[PDB]
Write a protein that binds this DNA or RNA. Structure first.
Ligand SMILES: [Cl-]
Ligand SMILES: [Cl-]
Ligand SMILES: [Mg+2]
Ligand SMILES: [Mg+2]
Ligand SMILES: [Mg+2]
Ligand SMILES: [Mg+2]
Ligand SMILES: [Mg+2]
Ligand code: NA
Length: 322
DNA sequence: CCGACAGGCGCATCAG
DNA sequence: CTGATGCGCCT
DNA sequence: GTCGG
């Protein structure tokens, strides 16, 4: 891509700040810069040109000048060569290991995938599964497989109760050619913000998906959110499909539009949109849009209504990507 | 200069 | 046990 | 790390 070198540099720095420094706002500032630069429709020629973009300040522009002059960043060169930094970064690639646990593990001498395997009894359940499927979870999912997974989940939900509506969101809904995982938003009429008229609405779907061997493991599971692993069936003599991450979110039926907006992302889009909601005197979460101490939920009966409240032209899901 | 930076589910842990 | 805190995760 | 007021 245009400015790929620059945006890669910034993403690496963001990951360093998140994973090693544990500085979430630096992480986010680097990602905001990477994002704005990725959308910039010109080959950046200097740091001063980039500095004109919102989210790119003096320090980034200075890094960009270094990167354009030399093709590298001494700061990242040092980070790359630093054994502890690299180890901590690596370990965070395991689902369930974040910055804190990564640092703790690296302090205890646990530096490698090899080390994690021989110390399974130091891992919680989520981390165990993340280690088990480490190579699989870094593989992306072609949209063709996403379509097959969608067919399974939609038909199996329908067998449980014809009144459930399952909507595949995330990058899939944004029209992406490949997805990192599957995100399923679920509603049922018995569950609204005013009442839960049936218990175990999510459990029943998760259980049905387990019975047919689609869901293979569970990372976490409560009344409204499921985080797990699933796999497509393969045919006689074929290599197995990789195991895949699947998230299911049961959202009150009358709060579907706020739910789908949230679940469609992108993550950066959601942060930008919620940050602009705040500037306009609103707060948005996956349930509601409220005036600001937040007040009572405003009426919504489309995704567009939410954009309208904050005075944004509608963006189609396909235009909410990075 | 500097306060704010999106919002929240599930789970592990801690105090009492 | 409850209630509070923070981690790691999701978009 | 960045930026609006
Ligand atoms: Cl974030
Ligand atoms: Cl709410
Ligand atoms: Mg991780
Ligand atoms: Mg993601
Ligand atoms: Mg996804
Ligand atoms: Mg997901
Ligand atoms: Mg947090
Ligand atoms: Na700028």
């Amino acid at each position: 891509t245009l400015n790929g070198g620059i945006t890669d540099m910034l993403t690496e720095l963001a990951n360093f700040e998140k994973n090693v420094s544990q500085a979430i706002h630096k992480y986010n500032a680097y990602r905001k810069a990477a994002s704005v630069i990725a959308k910039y429709p010109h080959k950046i020629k200097s740091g001063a040109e980039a500095k004109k973009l919102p989210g790119v300040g003096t320090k980034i522009a200075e890094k960009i000048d270094e990167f354009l002059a030399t093709g590298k960043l001494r700061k990242l060169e040092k980070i790359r060569q630093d054994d502890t930094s690299s180890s901590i970064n690596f370990l965070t690639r395991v689902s369930g290991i974040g910055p804190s646990a990564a640092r703790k593990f690296v302090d205890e001498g646990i530096k490698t995938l090899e080390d994690l395997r021989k110390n399974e009894d130091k891992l919680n359940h989520h981390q165990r599964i993340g280690l088990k499927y480490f190579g699989d979870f870094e593989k992306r999912i072609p949209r063709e497989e996403m379509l097959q997974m969608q067919d399974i989940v939609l038909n199996e939900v329908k067998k449980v109760d014809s009144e459930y509506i399952a909507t595949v969101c995330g990058s899939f809904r944004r029209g992406a050619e490949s997805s990192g995982d599957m995100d399923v938003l679920l509603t049922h009429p018995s569950f609204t913000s005013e009442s839960t008229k049936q218990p175990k609405l999510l459990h029943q779907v998760v259980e049905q998906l387990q019975k047919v061997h689609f869901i293979t493991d569970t990372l976490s599971k409560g009344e409204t959110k499921f985080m797990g692993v699933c796999q497509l069936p393969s045919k006689n003599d074929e290599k197995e499909y990789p195991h895949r991450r699947i998230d299911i979110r049961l959202i009150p039926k009358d709060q579907y539009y706020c739910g789908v907006l949230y679940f469609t992302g992108s993550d950066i889009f959601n942060k930008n949109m919620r940050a602009h909601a705040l500037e306009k005197g609103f707060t948005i979460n996956e349930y509601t849009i409220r005036p600001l101490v937040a007040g009572e939920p405003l009426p919504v009966d489309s995704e567009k209504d939410i954009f309208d409240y904050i005075q944004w032209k509608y963006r189609e899901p396909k235009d909410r990507s990075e």
